[PDB]
């Protein structure tokens, strides 16, 4: 499957829910801005609206799941994925040492709306640590952020 699967749709819904923090079924400029700040970007008002406008098929000013899914499923050009992942690493690696610690991971995840347990943080670190050196580096993060 290059094709859209039920599993993929369910994963995209889980991602949608991370944006739609009030659970009302639509992502507002306020909700999009909050997630972007958690990931280290402070978008302007017009950037948020201009971005929403490009995918806002029904013209209501906010993004519903159908619109989000269409965006995520699309066969695309210039997705900015590699560069966005590179940039996102910076909020994880807050001390700039090139590695994401357990504490660092826990901090970003809390900002994204989690309350992860110690076991989950430790498991997330261990899973990413494919070279087995005890730590999580940039290339390891990249593999997790395309899993």
């Amino acid at each position: 499957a290059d094709q859209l699967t039920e599993e993929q749709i369910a994963e995209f819904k889980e991602a949608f829910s991370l944006f739609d923090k009030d659970g009302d079924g639509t992502i507002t400029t306020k909700e999009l801005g909050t997630v972007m700040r958690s990931l280290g970007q402070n978008p302007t008002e017009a950037e948020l609206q201009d971005m929403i406008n490009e995918v806002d098929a029904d013209g209501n000013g906010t993004i519903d799941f159908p619109e989000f899914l269409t965006m995520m499923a699309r066969k695309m050009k210039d997705t900015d994925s590699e560069e966005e992942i590179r940039e996102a690493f910076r909020v994880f690696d807050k001390d700039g040492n090139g590695y994401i610690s357990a504490a660092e991971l826990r901090h970003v995840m809390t900002n994204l709306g989690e309350k992860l347990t110690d076991e989950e943080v430790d498991e997330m670190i261990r899973e990413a640590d494919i070279d087995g050196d005890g730590q999580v580096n940039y290339e390891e993060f990249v593999q997790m952020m395309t899993a």
Partner: peptide, 19 residues
């Protein structure tokens, strides 16, 4: 944990596509 990484990655991907 794997699904949590995937959710995070999909959020970043969504911001890229939106950008």
């Amino acid at each position: 944990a794997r699904r949590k990484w995937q959710k995070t990655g999909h959020a970043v991907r969504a911001i890229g596509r939106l950008s």
